[PDB]
Design a protein around this ligand. Sequence first.
Ligand SMILES: N=C(N)c1ccc(/C=N/c2ccc(Br)cc2)cc1
Ligand SMILES: [Ca+2]
Length: 223
Amino acid sequence: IVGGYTCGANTVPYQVSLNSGYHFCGGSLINSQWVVSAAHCYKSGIQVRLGEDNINVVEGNEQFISASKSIVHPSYNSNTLNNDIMLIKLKSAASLNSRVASISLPTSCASAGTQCLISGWGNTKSSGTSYPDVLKCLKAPILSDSSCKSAYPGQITSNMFCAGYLEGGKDSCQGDSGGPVVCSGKLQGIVSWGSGCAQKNKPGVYTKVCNYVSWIKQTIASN
Ligand SMILES: N=C(N)c1ccc(/C=N/c2ccc(Br)cc2)cc1
Ligand SMILES: [Ca+2]
């Protein structure tokens, strides 16, 4: 997260860190046994880390639970990043509490102008590299489909939306991949892509979760 703020320990209780020896992606806890992330976060050997603030220090509220299975969206295209969504099942159910909590799926798609919260442990610099140990947060509006398409001609599908600031300086970044965009207490987006980070006229692009609610629910019901 570039140009954001320190969230505060366990203030984003649905935020998870995916760890394969090291943090490599965020995700969102959607019930006691399932996490939503980006398809481009797929790899084997995933441990889900819940209740994290400082990902380098055991602070006392963590739950570390290995994934039993990952399900990448059947229509995920790694070239275009269309359908950039995946589900990860925990080997055992997380213990839910004030600091480890699921986030609701949307009942309807959020509109341009809606203020959302984007969070992650990704790079905090737009040029160069600095990775924070603690969770970073950014409040950002959903942008119009037209401004999104204008920023990224030929690249925005019906399964993507832009959020952030055309002026630049505030954005998600590498390492935030797979993490949440939450608007009015609903998971509306997943950190997916962008040209660099926090660049003028290159806002963040997010997987449009509201298009996947049926797939998510049906997949969970049978797996
Ligand atoms: N500016 C942004 N909001 C932004 C930029 C880049 C990313 C990560 N992008 C990747 C996508 C696919 C792979 Br594989 C590796 C990295 C995420 C967000
Ligand atoms: Ca920790």
